[PDB]
PDB file of C-alpha atoms in Angstrom:
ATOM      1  CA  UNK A   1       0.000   0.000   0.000  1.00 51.09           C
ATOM      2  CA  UNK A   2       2.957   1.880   0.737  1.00 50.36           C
ATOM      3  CA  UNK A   3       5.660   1.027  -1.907  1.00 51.01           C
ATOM      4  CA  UNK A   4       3.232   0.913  -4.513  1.00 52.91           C
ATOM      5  CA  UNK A   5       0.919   3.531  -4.272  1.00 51.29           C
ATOM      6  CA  UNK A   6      -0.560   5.624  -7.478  1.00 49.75           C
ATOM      7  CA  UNK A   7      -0.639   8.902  -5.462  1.00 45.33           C
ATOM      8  CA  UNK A   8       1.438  10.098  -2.085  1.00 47.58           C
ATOM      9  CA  UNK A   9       1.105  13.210   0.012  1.00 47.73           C
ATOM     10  CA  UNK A  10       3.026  16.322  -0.151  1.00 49.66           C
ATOM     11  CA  UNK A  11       7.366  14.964  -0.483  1.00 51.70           C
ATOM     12  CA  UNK A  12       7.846  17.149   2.604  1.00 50.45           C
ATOM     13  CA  UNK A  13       5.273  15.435   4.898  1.00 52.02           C
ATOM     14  CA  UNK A  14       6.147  12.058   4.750  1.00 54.42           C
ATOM     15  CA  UNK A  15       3.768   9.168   5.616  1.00 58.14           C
ATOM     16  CA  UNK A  16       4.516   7.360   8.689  1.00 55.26           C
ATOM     17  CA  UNK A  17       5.409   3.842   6.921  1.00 54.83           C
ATOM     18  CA  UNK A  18       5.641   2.254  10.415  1.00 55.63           C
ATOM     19  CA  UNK A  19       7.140  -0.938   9.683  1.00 59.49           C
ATOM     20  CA  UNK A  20       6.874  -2.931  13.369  1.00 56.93           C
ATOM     21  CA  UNK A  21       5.630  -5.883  14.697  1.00 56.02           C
ATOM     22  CA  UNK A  22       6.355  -7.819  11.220  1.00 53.02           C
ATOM     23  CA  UNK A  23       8.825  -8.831   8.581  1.00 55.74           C
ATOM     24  CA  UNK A  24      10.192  -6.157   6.668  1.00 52.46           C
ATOM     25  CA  UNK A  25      10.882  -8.242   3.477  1.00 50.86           C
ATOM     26  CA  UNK A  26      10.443  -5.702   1.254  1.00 49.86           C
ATOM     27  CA  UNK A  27      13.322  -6.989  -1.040  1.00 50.88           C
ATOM     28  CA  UNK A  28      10.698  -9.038  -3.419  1.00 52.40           C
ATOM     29  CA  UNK A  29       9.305  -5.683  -4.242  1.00 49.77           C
ATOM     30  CA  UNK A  30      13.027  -4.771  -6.062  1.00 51.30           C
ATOM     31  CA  UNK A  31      11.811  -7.287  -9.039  1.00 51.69           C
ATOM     32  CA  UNK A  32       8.420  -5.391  -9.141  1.00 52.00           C
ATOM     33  CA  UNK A  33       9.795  -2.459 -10.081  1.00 49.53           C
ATOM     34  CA  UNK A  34      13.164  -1.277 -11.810  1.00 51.10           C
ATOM     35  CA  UNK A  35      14.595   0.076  -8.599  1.00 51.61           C
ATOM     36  CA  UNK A  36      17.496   2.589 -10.065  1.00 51.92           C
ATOM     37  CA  UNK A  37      19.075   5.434  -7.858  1.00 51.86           C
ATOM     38  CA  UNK A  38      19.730   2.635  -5.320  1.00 49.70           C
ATOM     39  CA  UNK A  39      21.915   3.791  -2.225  1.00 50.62           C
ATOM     40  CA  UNK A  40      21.659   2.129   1.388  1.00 51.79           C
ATOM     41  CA  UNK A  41      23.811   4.011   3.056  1.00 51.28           C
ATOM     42  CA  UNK A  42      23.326   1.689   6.733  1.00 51.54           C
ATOM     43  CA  UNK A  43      22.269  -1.628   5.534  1.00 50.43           C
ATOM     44  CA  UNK A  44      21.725  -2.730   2.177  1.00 50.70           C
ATOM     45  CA  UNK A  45      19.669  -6.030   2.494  1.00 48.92           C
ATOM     46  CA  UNK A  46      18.783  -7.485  -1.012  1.00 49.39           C
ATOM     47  CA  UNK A  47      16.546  -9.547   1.838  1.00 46.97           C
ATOM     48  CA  UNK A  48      15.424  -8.705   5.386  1.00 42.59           C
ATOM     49  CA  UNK A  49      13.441 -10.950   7.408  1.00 39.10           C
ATOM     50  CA  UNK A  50      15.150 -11.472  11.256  1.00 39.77           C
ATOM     51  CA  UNK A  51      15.844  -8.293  13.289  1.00 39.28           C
ATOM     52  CA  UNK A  52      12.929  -6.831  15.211  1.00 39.43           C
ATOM     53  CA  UNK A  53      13.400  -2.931  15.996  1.00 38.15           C
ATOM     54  CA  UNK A  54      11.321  -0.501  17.522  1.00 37.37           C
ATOM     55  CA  UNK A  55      11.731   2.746  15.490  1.00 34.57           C
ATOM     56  CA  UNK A  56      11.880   2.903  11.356  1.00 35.96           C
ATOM     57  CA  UNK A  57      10.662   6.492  10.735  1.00 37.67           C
ATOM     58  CA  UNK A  58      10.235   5.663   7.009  1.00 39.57           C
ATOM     59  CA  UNK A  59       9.415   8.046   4.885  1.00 37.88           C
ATOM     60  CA  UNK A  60       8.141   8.391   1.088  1.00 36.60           C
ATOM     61  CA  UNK A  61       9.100  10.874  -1.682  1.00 36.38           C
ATOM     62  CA  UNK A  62       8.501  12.311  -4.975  1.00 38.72           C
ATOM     63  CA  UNK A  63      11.647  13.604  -6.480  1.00 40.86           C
ATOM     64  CA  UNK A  64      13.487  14.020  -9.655  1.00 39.85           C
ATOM     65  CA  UNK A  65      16.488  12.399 -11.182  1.00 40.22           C
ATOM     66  CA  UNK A  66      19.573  14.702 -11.257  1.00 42.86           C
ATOM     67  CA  UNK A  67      19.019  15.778  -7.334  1.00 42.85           C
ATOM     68  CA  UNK A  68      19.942  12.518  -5.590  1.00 43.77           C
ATOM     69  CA  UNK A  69      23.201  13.739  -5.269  1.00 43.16           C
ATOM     70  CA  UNK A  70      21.451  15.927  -1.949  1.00 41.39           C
ATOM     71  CA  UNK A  71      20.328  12.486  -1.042  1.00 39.17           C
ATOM     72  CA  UNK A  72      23.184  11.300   1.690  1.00 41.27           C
ATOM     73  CA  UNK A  73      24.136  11.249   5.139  1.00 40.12           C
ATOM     74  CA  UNK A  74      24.711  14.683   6.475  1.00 43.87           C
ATOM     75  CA  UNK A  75      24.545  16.574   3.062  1.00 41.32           C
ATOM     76  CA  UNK A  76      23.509  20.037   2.285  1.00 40.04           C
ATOM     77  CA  UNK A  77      21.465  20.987  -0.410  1.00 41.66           C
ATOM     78  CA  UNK A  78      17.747  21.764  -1.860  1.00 40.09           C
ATOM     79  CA  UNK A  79      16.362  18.792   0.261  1.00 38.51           C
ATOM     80  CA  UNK A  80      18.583  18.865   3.203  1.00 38.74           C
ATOM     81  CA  UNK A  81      17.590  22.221   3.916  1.00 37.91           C
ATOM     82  CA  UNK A  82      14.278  22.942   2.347  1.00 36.12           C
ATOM     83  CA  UNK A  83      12.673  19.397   2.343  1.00 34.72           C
ATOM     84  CA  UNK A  84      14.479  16.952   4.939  1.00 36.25           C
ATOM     85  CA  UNK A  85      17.883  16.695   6.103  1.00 36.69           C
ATOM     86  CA  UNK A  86      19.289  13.630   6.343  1.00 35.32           C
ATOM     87  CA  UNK A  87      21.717  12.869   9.692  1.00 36.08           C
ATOM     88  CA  UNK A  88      25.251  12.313   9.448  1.00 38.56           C
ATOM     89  CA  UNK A  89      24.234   8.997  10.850  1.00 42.58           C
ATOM     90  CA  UNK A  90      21.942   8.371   8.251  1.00 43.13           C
ATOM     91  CA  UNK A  91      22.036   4.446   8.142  1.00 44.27           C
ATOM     92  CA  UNK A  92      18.940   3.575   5.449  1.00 42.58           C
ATOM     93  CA  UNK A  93      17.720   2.411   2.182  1.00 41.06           C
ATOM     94  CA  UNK A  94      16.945   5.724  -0.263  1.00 41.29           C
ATOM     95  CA  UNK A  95      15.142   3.710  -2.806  1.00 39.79           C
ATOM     96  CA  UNK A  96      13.957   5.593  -5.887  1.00 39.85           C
TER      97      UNK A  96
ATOM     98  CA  UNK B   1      17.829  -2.969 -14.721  1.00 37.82           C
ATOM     99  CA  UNK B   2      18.902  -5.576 -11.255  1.00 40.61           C
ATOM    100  CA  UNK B   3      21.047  -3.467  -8.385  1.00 43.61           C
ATOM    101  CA  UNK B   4      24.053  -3.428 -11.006  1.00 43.08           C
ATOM    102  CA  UNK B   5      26.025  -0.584 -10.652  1.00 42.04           C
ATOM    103  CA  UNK B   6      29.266   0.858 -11.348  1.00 37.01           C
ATOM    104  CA  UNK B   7      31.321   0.482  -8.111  1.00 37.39           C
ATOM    105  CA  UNK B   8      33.256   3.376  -8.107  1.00 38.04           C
ATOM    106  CA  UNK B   9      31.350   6.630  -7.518  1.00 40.15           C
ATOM    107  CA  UNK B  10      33.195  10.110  -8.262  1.00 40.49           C
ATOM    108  CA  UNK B  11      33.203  12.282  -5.297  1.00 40.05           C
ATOM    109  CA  UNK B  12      32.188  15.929  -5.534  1.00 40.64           C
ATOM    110  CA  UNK B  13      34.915  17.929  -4.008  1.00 41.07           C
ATOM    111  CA  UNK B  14      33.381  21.137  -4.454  1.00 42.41           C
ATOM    112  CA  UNK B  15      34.909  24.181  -2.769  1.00 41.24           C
ATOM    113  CA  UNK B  16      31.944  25.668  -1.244  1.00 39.17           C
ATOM    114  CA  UNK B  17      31.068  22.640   1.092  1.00 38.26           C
ATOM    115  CA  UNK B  18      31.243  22.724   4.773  1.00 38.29           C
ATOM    116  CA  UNK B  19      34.677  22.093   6.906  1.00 35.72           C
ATOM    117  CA  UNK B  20      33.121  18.581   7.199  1.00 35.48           C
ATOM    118  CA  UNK B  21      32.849  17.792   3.520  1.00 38.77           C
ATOM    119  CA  UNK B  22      35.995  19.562   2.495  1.00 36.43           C
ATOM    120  CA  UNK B  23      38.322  16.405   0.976  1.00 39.08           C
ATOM    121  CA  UNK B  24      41.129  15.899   3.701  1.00 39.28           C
ATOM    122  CA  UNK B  25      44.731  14.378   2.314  1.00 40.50           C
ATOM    123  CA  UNK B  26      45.718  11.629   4.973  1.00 41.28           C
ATOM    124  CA  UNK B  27      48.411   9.517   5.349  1.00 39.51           C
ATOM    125  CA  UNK B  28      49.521   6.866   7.111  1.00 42.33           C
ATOM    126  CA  UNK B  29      52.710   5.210   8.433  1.00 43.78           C
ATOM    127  CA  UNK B  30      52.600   1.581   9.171  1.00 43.63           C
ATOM    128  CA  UNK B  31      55.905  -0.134  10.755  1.00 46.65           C
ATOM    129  CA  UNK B  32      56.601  -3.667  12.862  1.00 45.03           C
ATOM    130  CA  UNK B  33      58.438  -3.842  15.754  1.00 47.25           C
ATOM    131  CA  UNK B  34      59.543  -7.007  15.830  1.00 48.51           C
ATOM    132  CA  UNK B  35      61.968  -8.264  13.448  1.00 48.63           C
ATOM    133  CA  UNK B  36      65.481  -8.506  15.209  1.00 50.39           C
ATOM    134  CA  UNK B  37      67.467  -6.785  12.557  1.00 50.00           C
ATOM    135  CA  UNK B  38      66.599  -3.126  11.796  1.00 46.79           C
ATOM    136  CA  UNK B  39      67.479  -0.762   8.873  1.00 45.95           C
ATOM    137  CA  UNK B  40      66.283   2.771  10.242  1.00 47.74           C
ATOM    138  CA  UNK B  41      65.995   5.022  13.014  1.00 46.04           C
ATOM    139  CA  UNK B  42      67.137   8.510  14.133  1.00 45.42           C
ATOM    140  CA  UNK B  43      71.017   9.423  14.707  1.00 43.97           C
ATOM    141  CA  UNK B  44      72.990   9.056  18.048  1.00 44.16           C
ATOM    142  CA  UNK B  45      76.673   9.163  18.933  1.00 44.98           C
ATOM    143  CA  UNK B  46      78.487   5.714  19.234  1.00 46.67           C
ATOM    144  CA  UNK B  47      80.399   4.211  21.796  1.00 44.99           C
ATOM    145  CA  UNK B  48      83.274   2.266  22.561  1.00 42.24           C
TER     146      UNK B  48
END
């Protein structure tokens, strides 16, 4: 409902894709769509089915192509500072 | 297509970043101490 979704909410108010209390095998979804701009920063599982945590703070955007370079931990840029900044501990999947 | 990529990704040393993103030079000296025989150190006198 999340991943593949015809229409989101505004890129700077992100949904709250709380992913708890299950399996976060989200990998499958990689061969439903042609994932490209593909940077885990953290953890790059190409599958993810074991840990349990208690915070994700996912989040979903709607971006171009040529900006991902504002896309990393601690960077500055149009996102960083307009949209979201990511930490300099950013340890996630950006998936677009 | 799959996750291929290219694995080596050009970094953008750009001048107008932040102390923390400004490209540092580093370099590192690596030595063992324990071989018997040695070829180098600093100069002292001799004696008898």
């Amino acid at each position: 409902e999340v991943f593949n979704a015809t229409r989101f909410a505004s890129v700077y108010a992100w949904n709250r894709t709380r992913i708890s209390n299950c399996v976060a095998d989200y990998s499958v979804l990689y061969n439903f769509a042609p994932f490209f701009a593909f940077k885990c920063y953290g953890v790059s599982p190409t599958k993810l089915n074991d840990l349990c945590f208690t915070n994700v703070y996912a989040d979903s955007f709607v971006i171009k192509g040529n900006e991902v370079s504002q896309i990393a931990p601690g960077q500055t840029g149009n996102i960083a500072d307009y949209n979201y900044k990511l930490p300099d501990d950013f340890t996630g999947c950006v998936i677009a | 297509g799959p996750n291929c990529y290219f694995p080596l990704q050009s970094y953008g040393f750009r001048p107008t970043y932040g102390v923390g993103h400004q490209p540092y030079r580093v370099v590192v000296l690596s030595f063992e101490l324990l071989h018997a025989p040695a070829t180098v150190c600093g100069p002292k006198k001799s004696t008898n």
